[PDB]
């Protein structure tokens, strides 16, 4: 019915891809603690004192990945529900 399956299949695969990739990128940030090779982006113009501020900020950055994963998973569930409308 609403949000026909023809595009809902594509939506489901897209949501699965989003969940998986965002979760893995967040885990790579946290576990490796944002090695500059795998993590260039950040927001700090002053770090000359020590690395602890850098690590804290990179943890803060990596936190958002799991919120993105949750949103993608909810999207996938919504699309799966729309598929069941037959």
């Amino acid at each position: 019915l609403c949000c026909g399956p023809k595009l809902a299949a594509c939506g489901i695969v897209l949501s699965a891809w989003g969940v998986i990739m965002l979760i893995m990128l967040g885990i790579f940030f946290n576990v490796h603690s944002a090695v500059l090779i795998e993590d260039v982006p950040f927001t700090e113009k002053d770090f000359e004192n020590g690395p602890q501020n850098i690590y804290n900020l990179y943890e803060q950055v990596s936190y958002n990945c799991f919120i993105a994963a949750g949103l993608y998973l909810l999207l996938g569930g919504f699309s799966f529900c729309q598929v069941r409308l037959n």
Partner: protein, 79 residues
Amino acid sequence: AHSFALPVIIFTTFWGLIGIAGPWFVPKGPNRGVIITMLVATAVCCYLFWLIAILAQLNPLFGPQLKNETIWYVRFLWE
């Protein structure tokens, strides 16, 4: 720190093992030659590509160019 004789031995032995043993122990059927060619040419191309990629790094000439932020960060990550 990394070793060089150990990886070359391990990967050369693995690729010799597959590329030589696989052909000898195939079932006697209609798809024998196809699978033999597939596995053998696989092992050949695979191992050659790895060998070129690894020898291209042995005995480097000039080091990398690293930004100052990376120079600061690599202090307290690789150590």
